[PDB]
Design a protein around this ligand. Structure first.
Ligand SMILES: Cc1ccc2c(c1)sc(-c1ccc(N(C)C)cc1)[n+]2C
Length: 207
């Protein structure tokens, strides 16, 4: 499938795409305000994620650091990034269907729209000012709003026993972005699309 990744933010982001144990396409790229990056993701990919990273510094060998979403110091991500990271998540061609969602389970750094560019389903979006409204205990040192699991490392926030409920922190994310996962057992906001659809991920969709 084809994913177009568009930075509509007024600031530069460094996009990333990975399935956890491997890069998706090149794995990462600088996107200045307005730039688009088209990647190809192999059909059948399960557990793919796309995210933005902010305030990065890379040397000429693609090595460095980002204040949000860093994937072990690399420009071309092979692994997932450090929270906080708004997440576009997807699994393609699973029994004839694509599954997409946005998740705030690992916090939020940049607003995002995740939409098909082919027929047959709707997109999802989380574009509220989560960073502006972020509870004080969840604010990150480098911009962004962490999830409660990352900050407090409890069974209830991280849902480690597989039994857990919504929380005060959970409900904050859910209230600003009802279409995104707010905690591990949140009622799914997954969207089902036809197998082999194509997609656009837009950072800072409203502008
Ligand atoms: C950027 C920024 C701004 C404020 C801010 C943070 C980061 S992190 C933080 C904080 C986090 C945890 C706690 N406790 C668990 C007691 C108390 C305060 N504040 C208040």
């Amino acid at each position: 499938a084809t994913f177009e990744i568009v930075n509509r933010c007024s600031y530069t982001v460094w996009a990333a795409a990975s399935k956890g144990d491997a890069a998706l396409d090149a794995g990462g790229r600088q996107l200045n305000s307005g730039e688009s990056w088209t990647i190809n993701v192999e059909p059948g990919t399960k557990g793919g994620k796309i995210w933005a990273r902010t305030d990065c510094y890379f040397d000429d060998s693609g090595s460095g650091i980002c204040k949000t979403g860093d994937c072990g110091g690399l420009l071309r991500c092979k692994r997932f990034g450090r929270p906080p990271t708004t997440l576009a998540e997807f699994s393609l061609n699973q029994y004839g269907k694509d599954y997409i969602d946005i998740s705030n389970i690992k916090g939020f750094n940049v607003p995002m729209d995740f939409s098909p560019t082919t027929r047959g389903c709707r997109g999802v979006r989380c574009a509220a000012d989560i960073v502006g409204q972020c509870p004080a205990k969840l604010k990150a040192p480098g911009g962004g709003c962490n999830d409660a699991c990352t900050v407090f490392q409890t069974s209830e926030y991280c849902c480690t026993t597989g039994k857990c409920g919504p929380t005060e922190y959970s409900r904050f994310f859910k209230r600003l972005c009802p279409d995104a996962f707010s905690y591990v057992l949140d009622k799914p906001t997954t969207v089902t699309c036809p197998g082999s659809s194509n997609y656009r991920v837009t950072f800072c969709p409203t502008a």
